[PDB]
Short mmCIF file of all heavy atoms in Angstrom, two decimals:
data_model
loop_
_atom_site.label_atom_id
_atom_site.label_comp_id
_atom_site.label_asym_id
_atom_site.label_seq_id
_atom_site.Cartn_x
_atom_site.Cartn_y
_atom_site.Cartn_z
N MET A 96 -40.15 38.29 76.05
CA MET A 96 -40.09 37.16 75.13
C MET A 96 -38.66 36.93 74.67
O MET A 96 -38.27 35.81 74.36
CB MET A 96 -40.96 37.42 73.89
CG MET A 96 -42.45 37.53 74.16
SD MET A 96 -43.36 37.83 72.63
CE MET A 96 -45.00 37.06 73.01
N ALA A 97 -37.88 38.01 74.60
CA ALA A 97 -36.48 37.94 74.20
C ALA A 97 -35.72 37.18 75.29
O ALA A 97 -34.95 36.28 74.98
CB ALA A 97 -35.90 39.34 74.02
N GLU A 98 -35.93 37.55 76.55
CA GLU A 98 -35.26 36.87 77.66
C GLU A 98 -35.65 35.40 77.57
O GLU A 98 -34.81 34.51 77.67
CB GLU A 98 -35.73 37.38 79.03
CG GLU A 98 -35.99 38.87 79.19
CD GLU A 98 -34.80 39.73 78.88
OE1 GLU A 98 -33.86 39.24 78.21
OE2 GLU A 98 -34.80 40.91 79.30
N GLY A 99 -36.95 35.18 77.39
CA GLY A 99 -37.50 33.84 77.30
C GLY A 99 -36.87 33.03 76.19
O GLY A 99 -36.84 31.81 76.27
N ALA A 100 -36.37 33.71 75.17
CA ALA A 100 -35.72 33.05 74.05
C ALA A 100 -34.22 32.95 74.29
O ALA A 100 -33.54 32.08 73.75
CB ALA A 100 -36.00 33.81 72.74
N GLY A 101 -33.71 33.87 75.11
CA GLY A 101 -32.29 33.88 75.40
C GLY A 101 -31.49 34.92 74.64
O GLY A 101 -30.27 34.80 74.53
N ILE A 102 -32.16 35.94 74.10
CA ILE A 102 -31.49 37.01 73.36
C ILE A 102 -31.51 38.22 74.26
O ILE A 102 -32.03 38.17 75.37
CB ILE A 102 -32.26 37.46 72.10
CG1 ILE A 102 -32.76 36.28 71.28
CG2 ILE A 102 -31.37 38.32 71.22
CD1 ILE A 102 -33.68 36.74 70.17
N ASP A 103 -30.97 39.32 73.75
CA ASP A 103 -30.98 40.57 74.49
C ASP A 103 -32.24 41.32 74.04
O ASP A 103 -32.46 41.51 72.84
CB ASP A 103 -29.74 41.40 74.17
CG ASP A 103 -29.78 42.77 74.82
OD1 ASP A 103 -29.88 42.85 76.06
OD2 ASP A 103 -29.70 43.78 74.08
N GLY A 104 -33.07 41.72 75.00
CA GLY A 104 -34.28 42.43 74.67
C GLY A 104 -34.00 43.73 73.93
O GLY A 104 -34.73 44.10 73.01
N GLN A 105 -32.93 44.41 74.33
CA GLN A 105 -32.56 45.67 73.71
C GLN A 105 -32.17 45.48 72.26
O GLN A 105 -32.42 46.35 71.42
CB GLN A 105 -31.41 46.33 74.48
CG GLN A 105 -31.12 47.74 74.03
CD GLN A 105 -32.34 48.63 74.15
OE1 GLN A 105 -32.92 48.76 75.23
NE2 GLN A 105 -32.73 49.26 73.05
N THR A 106 -31.55 44.34 71.96
CA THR A 106 -31.14 44.01 70.60
C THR A 106 -32.38 44.00 69.70
O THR A 106 -32.43 44.68 68.67
CB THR A 106 -30.48 42.62 70.54
OG1 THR A 106 -29.25 42.64 71.26
CG2 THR A 106 -30.22 42.20 69.09
N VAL A 107 -33.38 43.22 70.10
CA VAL A 107 -34.62 43.13 69.33
C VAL A 107 -35.26 44.49 69.15
O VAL A 107 -35.74 44.79 68.06
CB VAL A 107 -35.64 42.20 70.01
CG1 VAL A 107 -36.81 41.98 69.07
CG2 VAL A 107 -34.99 40.88 70.39
N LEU A 108 -35.30 45.30 70.20
CA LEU A 108 -35.90 46.63 70.11
C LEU A 108 -35.15 47.57 69.17
O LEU A 108 -35.75 48.43 68.54
CB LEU A 108 -36.01 47.29 71.48
CG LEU A 108 -36.99 46.74 72.52
CD1 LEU A 108 -36.95 47.63 73.75
CD2 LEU A 108 -38.39 46.70 71.95
N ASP A 109 -33.83 47.42 69.09
CA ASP A 109 -33.05 48.30 68.23
C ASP A 109 -33.25 47.99 66.77
O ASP A 109 -33.01 48.83 65.90
CB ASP A 109 -31.55 48.20 68.56
CG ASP A 109 -31.23 48.67 69.97
OD1 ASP A 109 -31.73 49.73 70.40
OD2 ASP A 109 -30.45 47.97 70.65
N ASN A 110 -33.72 46.77 66.49
CA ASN A 110 -33.93 46.34 65.12
C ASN A 110 -35.40 46.22 64.76
O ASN A 110 -35.77 45.55 63.79
CB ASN A 110 -33.23 45.01 64.91
CG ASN A 110 -31.76 45.11 65.21
OD1 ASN A 110 -31.26 44.46 66.13
ND2 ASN A 110 -31.06 45.94 64.46
N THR A 111 -36.24 46.90 65.54
CA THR A 111 -37.67 46.87 65.30
C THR A 111 -38.23 48.27 65.22
O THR A 111 -38.14 49.04 66.17
CB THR A 111 -38.39 46.09 66.42
OG1 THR A 111 -37.87 44.76 66.48
CG2 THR A 111 -39.87 46.02 66.14
N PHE A 112 -38.79 48.60 64.06
CA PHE A 112 -39.41 49.90 63.84
C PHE A 112 -40.89 49.76 64.15
O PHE A 112 -41.52 48.78 63.78
CB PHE A 112 -39.26 50.35 62.38
CG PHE A 112 -37.84 50.66 61.98
CD1 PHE A 112 -37.07 49.72 61.32
CD2 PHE A 112 -37.28 51.90 62.30
CE1 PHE A 112 -35.74 50.00 60.96
CE2 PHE A 112 -35.95 52.20 61.95
CZ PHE A 112 -35.18 51.24 61.28
N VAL A 113 -41.45 50.76 64.83
CA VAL A 113 -42.85 50.75 65.19
C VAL A 113 -43.49 52.07 64.78
O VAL A 113 -42.98 53.14 65.12
CB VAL A 113 -43.03 50.56 66.71
CG1 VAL A 113 -44.51 50.59 67.07
CG2 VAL A 113 -42.37 49.26 67.17
N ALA A 114 -44.58 52.00 64.04
CA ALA A 114 -45.28 53.21 63.61
C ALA A 114 -46.72 53.16 64.10
O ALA A 114 -47.48 52.25 63.76
CB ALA A 114 -45.25 53.32 62.09
N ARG A 115 -47.08 54.14 64.92
CA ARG A 115 -48.43 54.23 65.47
C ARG A 115 -49.34 54.95 64.49
O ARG A 115 -49.18 56.15 64.22
CB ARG A 115 -48.41 54.96 66.82
CG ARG A 115 -49.77 55.03 67.51
CD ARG A 115 -50.39 53.65 67.76
NE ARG A 115 -51.84 53.69 67.59
CZ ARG A 115 -52.67 54.22 68.48
NH1 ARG A 115 -52.19 54.74 69.60
NH2 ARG A 115 -53.98 54.25 68.24
N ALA A 116 -50.29 54.20 63.93
CA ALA A 116 -51.25 54.74 62.98
C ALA A 116 -52.58 54.93 63.69
O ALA A 116 -53.11 54.00 64.30
CB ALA A 116 -51.41 53.80 61.81
N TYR A 117 -53.11 56.15 63.60
CA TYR A 117 -54.38 56.49 64.23
C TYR A 117 -55.54 56.35 63.24
O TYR A 117 -56.70 56.40 63.64
CB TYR A 117 -54.33 57.90 64.81
CG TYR A 117 -53.29 58.04 65.90
CD1 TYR A 117 -51.97 58.37 65.58
CD2 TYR A 117 -53.60 57.80 67.23
CE1 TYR A 117 -50.99 58.45 66.56
CE2 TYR A 117 -52.62 57.88 68.23
CZ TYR A 117 -51.31 58.20 67.88
OH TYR A 117 -50.33 58.28 68.84
N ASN A 118 -55.23 56.20 61.96
CA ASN A 118 -56.28 56.01 60.96
C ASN A 118 -55.77 55.26 59.73
O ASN A 118 -54.57 55.00 59.59
CB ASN A 118 -56.91 57.34 60.56
CG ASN A 118 -55.90 58.38 60.13
OD1 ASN A 118 -55.99 59.53 60.55
ND2 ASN A 118 -54.95 58.00 59.28
N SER A 119 -56.69 54.89 58.84
CA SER A 119 -56.34 54.15 57.64
C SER A 119 -55.34 54.89 56.76
O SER A 119 -54.50 54.26 56.11
CB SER A 119 -57.60 53.77 56.85
OG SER A 119 -58.34 54.90 56.44
N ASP A 120 -55.43 56.22 56.72
CA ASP A 120 -54.49 57.00 55.91
C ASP A 120 -53.07 56.83 56.41
O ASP A 120 -52.15 56.59 55.63
CB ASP A 120 -54.87 58.48 55.93
CG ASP A 120 -56.11 58.78 55.13
OD1 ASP A 120 -56.18 58.34 53.96
OD2 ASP A 120 -57.01 59.46 55.66
N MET A 121 -52.88 56.94 57.73
CA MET A 121 -51.57 56.76 58.33
C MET A 121 -51.11 55.32 58.15
O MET A 121 -49.95 55.06 57.87
CB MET A 121 -51.61 57.10 59.81
CG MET A 121 -51.86 58.57 60.10
SD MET A 121 -51.85 58.91 61.85
CE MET A 121 -50.10 58.84 62.22
N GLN A 122 -52.04 54.39 58.33
CA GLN A 122 -51.76 52.96 58.19
C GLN A 122 -51.22 52.67 56.78
O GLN A 122 -50.18 52.02 56.62
CB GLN A 122 -53.05 52.16 58.40
CG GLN A 122 -52.86 50.66 58.46
CD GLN A 122 -54.18 49.92 58.61
OE1 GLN A 122 -55.10 50.39 59.29
NE2 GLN A 122 -54.28 48.74 57.99
N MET A 123 -51.95 53.14 55.77
CA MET A 123 -51.57 52.93 54.39
C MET A 123 -50.29 53.67 54.00
O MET A 123 -49.47 53.14 53.26
CB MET A 123 -52.72 53.35 53.47
CG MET A 123 -53.94 52.47 53.60
SD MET A 123 -55.32 52.97 52.55
CE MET A 123 -54.65 52.54 50.91
N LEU A 124 -50.11 54.89 54.49
CA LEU A 124 -48.92 55.66 54.15
C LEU A 124 -47.65 55.07 54.77
O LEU A 124 -46.58 55.05 54.14
CB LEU A 124 -49.09 57.12 54.59
CG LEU A 124 -47.91 58.05 54.32
CD1 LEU A 124 -47.51 57.98 52.84
CD2 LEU A 124 -48.29 59.48 54.73
N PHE A 125 -47.77 54.58 56.01
CA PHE A 125 -46.64 53.95 56.69
C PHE A 125 -46.19 52.73 55.88
O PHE A 125 -45.00 52.49 55.74
CB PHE A 125 -47.05 53.50 58.10
CG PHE A 125 -46.95 54.58 59.14
CD1 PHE A 125 -47.95 54.73 60.10
CD2 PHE A 125 -45.84 55.41 59.19
CE1 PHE A 125 -47.84 55.70 61.09
CE2 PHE A 125 -45.72 56.39 60.19
CZ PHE A 125 -46.73 56.53 61.14
#
């Protein structure tokens, strides 16, 4: 989607935090 927009894909990824929550507790704590 970044290429499609004309940005650097790596740029977007470096500024995006991702937290994998396996349950509501993790979801809420994150």
Side-chain angles (χ1 to χ4, degrees):
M96 295 180 151
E98 321 301 19
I102 314 172
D103 175 58
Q105 189 57 56
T106 294
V107 188
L108 291 183
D109 297 315
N110 303 116
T111 302
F112 292 97
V113 179
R115 183 58 216 285
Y117 298 87
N118 53 225
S119 60
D120 288 310
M121 293 182 76
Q122 188 183 324
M123 293 179 70
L124 179 53
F125 275 137

